[PDB]
């Protein structure tokens, strides 16, 4: 339909999100060590639950 619409705000949001650098962190173990982690972590210690168990809960319900 219309095909020559405005190009003047190309890159609007990317150029206007405040940059913030990533925090450093201890390296995470790569390879077999990771699947070890993941195994003992996901089900052996068993952490947070709900009757379903939850991988990534932001600050809980409380």
């Amino acid at each position: 339909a219309k095909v020559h619409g405005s190009l003047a705000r190309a890159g609007k949001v990317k150029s206007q999100t405040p940059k913030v650098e990533k925090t450093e962190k201890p390296k995470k173990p790569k390879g077999r060590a990771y699947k070890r982690l993941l195994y003992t972590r996901r089900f052996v210690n068993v952490t947070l639950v709900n009757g379903k168990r939850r991988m990534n809960p932001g600050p809980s319900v409380q």
């Binding site: 619409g5 190009l7 890159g11 609007k12």
Partner: protein, 144 residues
């Protein structure tokens, strides 16, 4: 009955009546008539490369609303004119006029994708570098 013949010596018709009806099968017909080589902007080839004629701001179909930012391209191999979507935020500032870019399809089988009309190709490279790289600042556009 079943409306098709069963006769031990009916191979002829079955062999033929199926050949005769493979034609309502789209992909088959497209493949047999070589549409890919004939109509299609690319050769059939997965990718093509052309030159950027103008920046186009194409307005999205309903119920959406935006300016979809595209480019008009002169495909080098047959000088066909085909318009292409520049993906990601403000990457239209990465391609210029007379710039030579690489286009590829939309995964949608030559049909157009999403709310962008008449566009069926994406811009994967410009001036020989990747687009993703230009965007994620892994590289620089070579100084034309």
């Amino acid at each position: 009955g079943k409306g098709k013949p069963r006769g031990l010596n009916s191979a002829r018709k079955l062999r033929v009546h199926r050949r005769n009806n493979r034609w309502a099968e789209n992909n088959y017909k497209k493949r047999l008539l070589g549409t890919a080589f004939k109509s299609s902007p690319f050769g059939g080839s997965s990718h093509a490369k052309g030159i950027v004629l103008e920046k186009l701001g194409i307005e999205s179909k309903q119920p959406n609303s935006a300016i979809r930012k595209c480019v008009r391209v002169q495909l080098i191999k047959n000088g066909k004119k085909v318009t292409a979507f520049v993906p990601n935020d403000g990457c239209l500032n990465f391609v210029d006029e007379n710039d030579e870019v690489l286009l590829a399809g939309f995964g949608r089988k030559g049909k157009a994708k999403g709310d962008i009309p008449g566009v069926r190709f994406k811009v994967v490279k410009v001036s020989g570098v990747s687009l993703l790289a230009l965007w994620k600042e892994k590289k620089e556009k070579p100084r034309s």
